[PDB]
């Protein structure tokens, strides 16, 4: 994006300043130049960027946290990347290691012996302790002038918490003398130390990082375990699904309301003229043969290989993820201890209307569920990723995204009050997507390029998303238009070949290509007629043939129509009888489901099953409020929802959606991803 601006990098050390001007010298010659301002505290720097003296700095997981807090809401615009065998990464993970065979899981740390890395260390203090604070377990609430932080003594019978000088049982298990055992360097300190402690039977849990079991014990790793927050243990290598939280990489941060593009543009050029391989000398990351301590990690970590940009919708809170953010809430902010799941659900709504209905919900449930409001589905997910909201009913599409953002399906919407409902329920009954055609057994799926297709409307499942998704799987281009010769896809941009055949209102002038019933070929029906007047391939749902053909639609285009006139295009290449669906289909698009974070999952489940007994299709109080009836239509649930099918514990979105739909969407979305899927993709790393 175009300028000739300087960028004021901030340094807090002279050494740092040293390479900062070394940097600038290398490219006085470019559009976006650099400036160096040194200060004493990262923190000053923070405020020196909130007041516009400066432009960017590289923060640490916890630093970047407070840089985000008002009055400076500086946001991470760029993070580092670090791997060797694997590829690349924007993270590391703290674990709680236990010994295999001792049989306690996370509720049971009350009165354990613990081994830690040091006081005020993220891995060994902040994460575990703050977690255990938010859950309840360590009961710390309101430090105004309440004796405080080292209350963990009341929780754990003994510990080894290095460099603590405020208690004594926390110093108890430290190996050494007495004066040196609780020193910050007292030998059970740091990572390895905390591990040895545990190996010395001096703990029950060493709160550490993942690599440690390989680092200290690669022989006997198999004797050790992880203690996860869902109340389970998992082996050493299952860390990615068992971490207490992943101190997401070092972030360059800057102002929201500013010239960030310029800074990323400098970091960009710099990043790799003078990169990981500089043909010669100024390095921007240069890490070896143990250099002097004050030399290393100036400006960026030397470990770094790569500076990757942050998706613009990202904020401190999202980047750091949940886990860490809330751990830092706990100790870094107030004493907050009897509410992990404060047994009562913030349902997150879209649009005032939705709110109104949720307000009804609120009331009649006697406040079991409370309500938040937004302007978007986009947004409600973020309030769910951020723990400001709990659950939302999502569409098949939305589900994928949220599922990528780690929201798991809970109850799926079923629309037949007669089929899948309790015992009755097996999985909720989706509908199909199928490409219908006529006689000419010339046409097949893999030969479809360049034919004339008719589509329901763009942005719709049936007519647009599934065919085009699948098709893009095959092509690798976001070419849409330029795949078929021409066809109809309502609301296409009128120069688009997929507006060529559209007839608008009959053919009297008016609305040649609108996605509305003021267009001749709109909807499933319109498109079935569109196979009939002009198109070669129709993309629709499986009920469309058998809803208009043999004396079902009495419009003149349809008058002589009967089902052997239309066949199904199978994906495998073959064709079939319209009347033959579960076997021949493009995709079986599942219902809406509600998603939340895994933690909220099983209670959400209960909420609704209760709420339904009272306000669903044969509810106890349904005269006050019908959970499923709306003042308009799809207000919270899909108006002609019948019952709420329980999906079994920990369902993957992928399972819920099935391989066909999952493939459709995933491919369609490599084309032009939205802001939210982008971030959820970056934090699939997290």
Pairing state between β 537-540 and 434-437: antiparallel
Residue 206: closest CA among 214, 216, 197:
197
Contact 349, 361 (CB under 8 A): no
Characterise 67 by phi-psi region: left (phi > 0), alpha (psi -120 to 50), beta (else): alpha
The CA distance from 566 to 545, in Å, is 8
The answer to whether residues 445 and 570 touch, using CB atoms and an 8 Å cutoff, is: yes
**Right CATH for 92-250 from 3.40.190.10, 3.20.20.70, 3.40.50.1970, 3.50.50.60:** 3.40.190.10
Q: Kindly state the tokens that stand for 23.
A: 């940097």
List % helix, strand, coil for the chain (3-state, nearest 5): 35, 15, 50
C-alpha to C-alpha distance for 595 and 391, rounded to whole angstroms: 6
**DSSP assignment letter at 11:** E
How far is residue 185 from each of residues 79, 117, 123, 127, 158, measured CA to CA in Å? 30, 10, 16, 20, 19
The two tokens of residue 401 are 């995204």
User: How many of the other CB atoms lie within 10 Å of CB of 474?
Assistant: 13
Token pair 């990082």 in the structure block, residue: 209
How far apart CA 310 and CA 261 sit, in angstroms, is 11
The phi, psi pair for 172, rounded to 5°, reads -50, -50
Among 583, 682, 685, 686, CA closest to 311 = 682
Distance of alpha carbon 221 from alpha carbon 202, whole angstroms: 18
Q: What are phi and psi of 64, to 5 degrees?
A: -55, -40
Spell out a b/e string for 206-239, using b for 16 or more CB atoms within 10 Å of the CB, else e: bbbbbebbeebbeeeeeebbbbbbeeebbebebb
- 653: its two tokens: 């979105």
Return all residues near 255 (Cβ < 8 A) that are at least 6 apart. 49, 50, 52, 55, 74, 75
Q: Which residue carries 């977690």 as its tokens?
A: 131
Question: DSSP character for 428?
Answer: -
DSSP letters spanning 298-309: SSS-TT--EEEE
How many Å separate Cα 367 from the centre of its chain?
A: 29
φ, ψ for residue 410 (rounded to 5)?
Answer: -120, -70
**Alpha carbon distances (Å) from 507 to 139, 496, 503, 510:** 73, 19, 6, 8
How far is 527 from 434, CA to CA, in rounded Å?
Answer: 12
What is the C-alpha to C-alpha distance for residues 195 and 115, in angstroms, rounded to an integer?
Answer: 7
CA distances for 476 relative to 72, 323, 469, 669, 676, angstroms: 42, 37, 10, 11, 22
What is the experimental resolution, given in Å to one decimal place?
A: 4.0
408 touches 601 (CB < 8 A) = yes
Beta bridge partners of 253: 57, 76
| Rounded Cα gap, residues 414 and 416, in angstroms | 6
Helix (H, G, I), strand (E, B) or coil at 203: coil
The token pair that represents 536 in the structure block: 């070669």
Whether 130 and 328 have beta carbons less than 8 Å apart is answered as: yes
Provide DSSP, 636-675: SB-TT--EEEEPPTT--HHHHHHHHHHHHHHHHHHHS--H
Integer Cα distance of 589 and 581 in angstroms: 13
Q: Which CATH number fits domain 1-91+251-339: 3.40.50.10320, 3.40.190.10, 3.30.200.20, 3.40.47.10?
A: 3.40.190.10
Q: What is the DSSP string of 20-86?
A: HHHHHHHTTTSSSEEEEEE-S-HHHHHHHHHTTT--BEEE-HHHHHHHTSTT--EEEEEEEE--SSS
Q: How far apart are CA 541 and CA 588, in angstroms?
A: 9
- Tokens describing residue 111: 């009165």
DSSP letter, residue 589: -
Contact 191/212 with Cβ under 8 angstroms?
yes
HSE of 518, CA atoms in CB hemisphere, 13 A? 7
Where do we find the tokens 């238009």? 481
Considering only CA atoms, which of 97, 668, 2, 600 is closest in space to residue 396?
A: 668
Helix (H, G, I), strand (E, B) or coil at 501: coil
For residue 230, what are the contacts with CB-CB under 8 A and spacing of at least 6?
598, 599
Residue 370 and residue 381: Cα distance in Å, rounded? 16
Cα–Cα distance, 161 to 184 (Å, whole number): 9
Q: How far is CA 41 from CA 9, 66, 495, in A?
A: 14, 13, 58
User: Which residue do the tokens 């933690």 mark?
Assistant: 599
In Å, how far from its chain's centre is CA 360? 30
What is the rounded distance in angstroms from the CA atom of residue 603 to the CA atom of residue 54? Answer: 47
- E-strand spans in 450-525? 453-455
Give the distance from CA 628 to its chain's centroid: 28
Residue 438's nearest CA partner among 509, 294, 510, 534 is 534
Tell me the chain's radius of gyration from C-alpha atoms.
Answer: 30
CA 629 to the chain's CA centroid? 31
Distance CA(267)–CA(250), nearest Å, equals: 14
Query: Where do the structural domains in the chain lie, given as residue ranges?
Result: 1-91+251-339, 92-250, 340-433+590-686, 434-589
Max intra-chain CA distance, the chain:
98
The token pair at 136 is 């309840």
What is the three-class DSSP state of 99? strand
| Token pair belonging to 183 | 């020193």
277's CB contacts (< 8 A; 6+ apart) are none
Contact call for residues 92 and 247 (beta carbons, < 8 A): yes
Q: After which residues is the chain broken (C to N over 2.5 A)?
A: 92, 245, 344, 432, 587
Strand pairing category for 575-577 and 567-569: antiparallel
Residues 6+ apart with CB under 8 A from 194: 115, 116, 117, 124, 160, 188, 203, 206, 207, 208
State the Cα–Cα distance between residues 390 and 381, nearest whole angstrom. 9
Residue 383 neighbours by CB distance under 10 Å? 17
- Token pair for 622: 């349904």
Q: Is 312 left (phi over 0), alpha (psi -120 to 50) or beta?
A: alpha
* Spatial separation of the C-alpha atoms in residues 161 and 172, rounded to whole Å: 9
Among 417, 367, 363, 371, which residue's Cα sits nearest to residue 390?
Answer: 371
Angle at 327 between CA 321 and CA 332, to 5 degrees: 120
List the beta bridge partners of residue 33.
6
In the structure encoding, which two tokens stand for residue 596, read together?
Answer: 């939340």
Q: Which residues pair with 396 in a beta bridge?
A: none
3-state secondary structure of 108: helix
Within 8 A by CB and 6+ apart from 223, the residues are: 99, 100, 217
User: Hey, what are 232's tokens?
Assistant: 């389970």
- Please give the C-alpha separations between residue 137 and each of 156, 167, 459, in angstroms, as whole numbers: 10, 19, 48
- CA contacts within 13 A on the Cβ side of 2: 0
User: Can you tell me which residue has the tokens 């942005």?
Assistant: 459
CA dist 168 and 400 (Å) reads: 51
Q: What is the DSSP letter of 488?
A: B
Fold classification of 434-589 is: D-Maltodextrin-Binding Protein; domain 2 (3.40.190)
Return the structure tokens found at 416: 């037949």
CB-based contact 261:1 (threshold 8 Å) = yes
Take residue 517 and report the two structure tokens written for it. 């019933």
The helix (H) or strand (E) run that includes residue 215 is helix 212-216
Strand 74-81 vs strand 251-255: parallel, antiparallel, or unpaired? antiparallel
Q: Where are the alpha helices (DSSP H) in 307-395?
A: 316-319, 321-332, 352-364, 377-385
- How many other β-carbons are positioned within 10 Å of the β-carbon of residue 25? 9
Nearest alpha-carbon partner for 542 in 518, 571, 500, 577? 577
- Separation of alpha carbons 253 and 62, rounded Å: 13
Between strands 537-540 and 575-577, the pairing is unpaired
Write out the CATH class of domain 340-433+590-686. alpha beta
Cα(222)–Cα(502) distance, integer angstroms: 66
Distance between CA atoms of 383 and 377, rounded to whole angstroms? 10
Close Cβ partners of 208 (under 8 Å, ≥ 6 residues apart) = 94, 95, 96, 97, 117, 123, 124, 191, 194, 195
Q: How was this structure determined?
A: X-ray
Euclidean distance between CA atoms 356 and 607, whole angstroms: 20
Helix (H) or strand (E) holding 134: helix 127-135
Cα 665 to Cα 400: distance, rounded to the nearest angstrom: 8
For 351-447, strand residue ranges (E) read: 370-374, 392-394, 408-414, 434-437
Name the one residue in this structure whose structure tokens are 């010239």.
259
């Amino acid at each position: 994006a175009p300028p000739k601006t300087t960028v004021r990098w901030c340094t807090i050390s002279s050494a740092e300043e040293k390479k900062c001007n070394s940097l600038k010298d290398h490219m006085q010659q470019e559009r976006v130049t650099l400036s160096c301002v040194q200060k004493a505290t990262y923190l000053d720097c923070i405020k020196a960027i909130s007041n516009n003296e400066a432009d960017a700095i590289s923060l640490d997981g916890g630093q970047v946290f407070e840089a985000g807090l008002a009055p400076y809401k500086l946001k991470p615009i760029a993070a580092e990347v670090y791997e060797r065998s694997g590829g690349s990464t924007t993270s590391y993970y703290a674990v709680a290691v236990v010994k295999k065979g001792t049989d306690f899981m996370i509720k049971d740390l009350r009165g354990k012996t613990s081994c830690h890395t040091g006081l005020g260390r993220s891995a060994g203090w902040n994460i575990p302790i703050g977690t255990l604070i938010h859950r309840e377990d360590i009961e710390w609430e309101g430090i105004e002038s309440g004796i405080s932080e080292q209350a963990v003594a009341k929780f754990f019978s003994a510990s080894c918490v290095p460099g603590a000088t405020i208690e004594q049982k926390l110093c108890r298990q430290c190996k050494g003398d007495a004066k040196t055992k609780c020193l910050r360097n007292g030998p059970y300190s740091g990572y390895s130390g905390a591990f040895q402690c545990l190996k010395d039977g001096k703990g029950d849990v060493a709160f550490v990082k993942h690599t440690t079991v390989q680092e200290n014990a690669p022989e006997e790793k198999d004797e050790y375990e992880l203690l996860c927050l869902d109340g389970s243990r998992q082996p050493v290598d299952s860390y990615k699904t068992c971490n207490w939280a992943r101190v997401a990489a070092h972030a360059v941060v800057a102002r929201d309301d500013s010239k960030i593009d310029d800074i990323w543009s400098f970091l960009g050029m710099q990043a790799y003229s003078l990169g990981v391989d500089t043909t010669s000398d100024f390095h921007l990351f240069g890490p070896p043969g143990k250099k002097d301590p004050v030399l290393k990690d100036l400006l960026f970590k030397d470990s770094a290989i790569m500076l990757k940009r942050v998706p613009e919708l990202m904020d401190s809170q999202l980047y750091l993820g949940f886990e860490y953010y809330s751990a830092i809430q706990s100790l870094r902010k107030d004493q907050l201890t009897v509410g992990p799941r404060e047994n009562k659900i913030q349902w997150c709504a879209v649009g005032k209307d939705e709110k109104s209905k949720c307000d009804r919900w609120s009331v009649v449930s006697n406040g079991e569920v409370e309500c938040t409001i937004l302007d978007d589905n986009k947004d409600c997910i973020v309030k769910i990723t951020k723990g400001e909201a709990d659950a939302i009913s999502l569409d098949g599409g939305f589900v994928y995204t949220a599922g990528v953002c780690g929201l798991v399906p809970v109850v799926g919407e079923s629309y037949e009050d007669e089929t899948q409902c309790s015992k009755d329920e097996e999985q909720p009954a989706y509908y199909f997507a199928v490409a219908v055609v006529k006689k000419s057994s010339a046409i097949t799926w893999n030969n479809l390029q360049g034919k004339k297709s008719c589509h329901t409307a763009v942005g719709r499942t049936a007519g647009w998303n599934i065919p085009m998704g699948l098709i893009h799987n095959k092509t690798g281009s976001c070419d849409f238009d330029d795949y078929f010769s021409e066809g109809c896809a309502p609301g296409s941009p009128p120069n688009s070949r997929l507006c060529k055949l559209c007839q608008g209102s009959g053919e009297n002038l008016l609305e040649k290509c609108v996605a509305s019933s003021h267009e001749k070929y709109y909807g499933y029906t319109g498109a079935l007629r569109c196979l009939v007047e002009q198109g070669d391939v129709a993309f629709i749902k499986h009920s469309t043939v058998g809803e208009n053909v043999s004396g079902s639609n009495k419009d003149d285009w349809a008058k002589g129509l009967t089902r052997d006139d239309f066949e199904l295009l199978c994906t495998n290449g073959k064709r079939a009888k319209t009347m033959d669906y579960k076997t021949c289909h493009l995709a079986k698009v599942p219902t809406h489901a509600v998603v939340a974070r895994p933690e909220k999952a099983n209670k959400i489940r209960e909420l609704l099953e209760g709420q339904e007994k009272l306000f669903g299709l044969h509810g106890t109080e349904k005269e006050r409020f019908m959970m499923f009836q709306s003042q308009t239509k799809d207000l919270l649930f899909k108006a002609l929802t019948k019952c709420l099918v329980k999906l079994r514990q920990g369902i993957t979105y992928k399972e819920f959606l099935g391989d066909e739909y999952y493939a459709s969407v995933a491919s369609l979305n490599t084309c032009n991803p939205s802001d939210l899927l982008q971030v959820c993709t970056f934090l699939e790393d997290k």
